[PDB]
Amino acid sequence: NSSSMQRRDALNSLTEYLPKFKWKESKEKILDIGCADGSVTNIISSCCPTDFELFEACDVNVKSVKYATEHYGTSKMRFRVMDIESDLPKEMKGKFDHVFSFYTLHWIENQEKAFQNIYDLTADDGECFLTLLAQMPVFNLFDALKHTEKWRHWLRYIKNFISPYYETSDPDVVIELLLKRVGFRYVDVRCRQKKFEFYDLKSFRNLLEAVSPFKVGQELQEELIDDVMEVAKEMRIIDTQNSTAKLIYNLVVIHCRK
Amino acid sequence: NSSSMQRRDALNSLTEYLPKFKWKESKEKILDIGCADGSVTNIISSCCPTDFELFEACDVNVKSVKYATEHYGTSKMRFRVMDIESDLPKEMKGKFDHVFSFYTLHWIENQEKAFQNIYDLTADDGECFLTLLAQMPVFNLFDALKHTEKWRHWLRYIKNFISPYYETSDPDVVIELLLKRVGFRYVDVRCRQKKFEFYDLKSFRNLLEAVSPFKVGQELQEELIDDVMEVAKEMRIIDTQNSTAKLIYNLVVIHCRK
């Protein structure tokens, strides 16, 4: 049960960039896109040196984890279920002075919609701090499995989708070009190479079981992840001699203002 | 219910210094002095890029909060009740490759004992990352109340104690001199000026109620903290016109090796 790399990365990126944004607000309404567990939300709020006396809003699509935090993240700092790929509830358009979107580790289908939503959810002279993934071997892992002669036929009807910036050259400029066109006045995108090591394959298997894009039966789910773990060895994502797994991935840190 | 300044400070100091220490260990046993809520312990573990497959040990003196986290911080990463001012359980002498001690906000009676314990709890070529408080108006606040003609007589038998480094000039050199004498081969002590603002007096009162060094009856505890809040206005720790409270305090960041 480790979501640690998301938590570690959310943390290091937040701390590194805290000094770079200006709050200069008497009241303040802050939104956190892809909250999941409130572990990050709870440290964000404490690390934010501003008033935000109420309406620290946060959303996720998985509604079990959201409610699980509604019980734990506590009151007088709102929780919600929401998708940023869905059409915007106009009620909260331009409601938030600060938006946080740390990477989800679920493949996103439509980016510019999500970016346009981040643009529409932000008030004026309001800041956005987003991180997302340019290269992530976990995505490459499942994609390969989707293309094994065993599974290729049965997962054909599942949509791979496309990121206009994922595993492209200079994803930082691509995303900068996109965000300006969406209307963002200030933007500052940087690539950060990250490494996360799993010291037992059981920990690695639990991530893949959490992240699997595939809806196999309780019957098959074992067999599926067994074959992903095998593909992971072929890919050298797993060290077969150490029984370790190292993820080398590229993080895109977006700091922008409207 | 905000322990945020301890959490915010633990965080910023940890992240800033993560790149500066070398793990270079195959196994690893890590101890966290003054754990309280496992909020910091849970982010430390995720931010530590090392094996520590088991024996991530942690202690506090208040046994309700410890058990409260034993239920929440989960298994295969040990919890314990312990005081670092008490005589060392030899069982864990030189057991830990990394020791963390983020400041407690309770006045410590004996430092060199605690420092000597930090020295005895650490294995060889093992790192210590400690933060503690050089100047903190909260301590000055209660001290003044201890010396009001109303309370002076009734709190006379309570011990004020002394820090050889607290509200001294160059506390950084004093603590460096002490830690070397304890035996530490590498030491690197720095002063960090910190500011934390409370935007309502109710939040401030809840801290003081949590931190109060004084054992007044449920009957009197209200009257006591009412008088601390009044002393806080006299001290200009509380802005009477904004109904805010700003804490300007000095943090001592210790990075050392045996």
The secondary structure of chain A, three-state, reads CCCHHHHHHHHHHHHHHHHHCCCCCCCCCEEEECCCCCHHHHHHHHHCCCCCCCCEEEECCCHHHHHHHHCCCCCCCCCCCCCCCCCCCHHHCCCEEEEEECCCCCCCCCHHHHHHHHHHCEEEEEEEEEEEEEECHHHHHHHHHHCCCCCCCCCCCCCCCCCCCCCCCCHHHHHHHHHHHHCCCEEEEEEEEEEEEECCHHHHHHHHHHHCCCCCCHHHHHHHHHHHHHHHHHCCCEECCCCEEEEEEEEEEEEEEC
Nearest CA in chain A to B194: A49
| Nearest residue to B11 via CA among A23, A132, A18 | A18
| Nearest residue to B105 via CA among B146, B48, B149, B61 | B61
C-beta atoms of A1 and B39 within 8 A: no
Measured CA to CA, the distance from residue A118 to residue A123 in angstroms comes to 10
End-to-end CA distance of chain A: 38
Cα dist from B96 to A107, A256, B242, whole Å? 40, 43, 47
Q: Which residues on A lie below 8 Å from B11 (Cβ)?
A: 11, 15, 43, 46-47
End-to-end CA distance of chain B: 38
Chain center to CA of A52? 24
User: Which residue among B2, B15, B51 sits closest to A15, beta carbon to beta carbon?
Assistant: B15
C-beta atoms of A8 and B46 within 8 A: yes
B123–chain A nearest CA distance, Å = 23
Check: CB of residue B136 under 8 Å from CB of residue B251.
no
C-beta atoms of A74 and B8 within 8 A: no
Cα dist from B213 to B103, B134, B145, B151, B156, whole Å? 16, 18, 11, 14, 13
| Nearest residue to A172 via CA among A131, A139, A137, A138 | A131
* Resolution for this experimental structure (Å): 3.0
The dihedrals phi and psi of A10, each to the nearest 5 degrees, come to -50, -45
- For chain B, list the strands marked E by DSSP: 30-33, 56-59, 96-101, 122-135, 186-198, 238-239, 244-257
Residue with tokens 């805010």: B244
Question: Count of CB contacts below 8 A, A vs B?
Answer: 53
Residue with tokens 């309001």: A126
Q: Class for domain A3-257, per CATH?
A: alpha beta
A135–chain B nearest CA distance, Å = 20
C-beta atoms of B11 and A15 within 8 A: yes
Check: CB of residue A134 under 8 Å from CB of residue A166.
yes
Q: Which residues on B lie below 8 Å from A44 (Cβ)?
A: none
Report which secondary-structure segment, H or E, holds B176.
helix B171-182
C-beta atoms of A16 and B15 within 8 A: yes
Measured CA to CA, the distance from residue B101 to residue A224 in angstroms comes to 44
Chain A residues with CB under 8 Å of a chain B CB are 1-2, 4, 7-8, 11-12, 15-16, 18, 39, 42-43, 45-47, 49, 51, 53, 74, 195-197, 199-200
Angle at A113 between CA A29 and CA A87, to 5 degrees: 70
Q: How many residues are given for chain B?
A: 258
A103–chain B nearest CA distance, Å = 16
**Greatest pairwise CA separation for chain B in angstroms:** 60
| Nearest residue to B228 via CA among B211, B246, B242 | B211
How many Cα atoms occupy the beta-carbon half-sphere of A225 within 13 Å? 20
Query: Quick one: tokens of B204?
Result: 């401030």
| Burial state string for A119-132 with b = 16 or more CB within 10 A and e = fewer than 16 | bbbbbeebbbbbbb
The one-letter amino acid at B130: L
Query: What 3-state DSSP class applies to B27?
Result: coil
Cα dist from A220 to A164, A205, B22, whole Å? 33, 15, 43
Check: CB of residue A36 under 8 Å from CB of residue A3.
yes
Measured CA to CA, the distance from residue B30 to residue B11 in angstroms comes to 17
Q: Best of B15, B48, B51 to disrupt the A interface by mutation (most A CBs within 10 Å)?
A: B15
Query: Quick one: tokens of A166?
Result: 């994922």
Q: Best of A5, A46, A75, A197 to disrupt the B interface by mutation (most B CBs within 10 Å)?
A: A46
> Who contacts B177 (Cβ-Cβ below 8 Å, separation ≥6)?
none
Q: Best of A2, A15, A41, A52 to disrupt the B interface by mutation (most B CBs within 10 Å)?
A: A15
Query: What 3-state DSSP class applies to B100?
Result: strand
Query: What 3-state DSSP class applies to B172?
Result: helix
Q: Which residues on A lie below 8 Å from B197 (Cβ)?
A: 49
Q: CA torsion angle for A104, A106, A111, A115 (degrees, to 10)?
A: -20
Tally Cβ neighbours within 10 Å of residue B239. 14
The dihedrals phi and psi of A36, each to the nearest 5 degrees, come to 55, -120
Tell me B147's DSSP state: T
A88–chain B nearest CA distance, Å = 32
Measured CA to CA, the distance from residue B215 to residue B225 in angstroms comes to 11
| Nearest residue to B85 via CA among B51, B61, B64, B50 | B61
Measured CA to CA, the distance from residue A132 to residue A104 in angstroms comes to 8
Q: Which residues on A lie below 8 Å from B54 (Cβ)?
A: none
Query: What 3-state DSSP class applies to B168?
Result: coil
B149–chain A nearest CA distance, Å = 37
Q: Give B28: exposed, middle or buried? Use CB within 10 Å, 0-12, 13-18, 19+.
A: buried
| Nearest residue to B57 via CA among B65, B45, B68 | B45
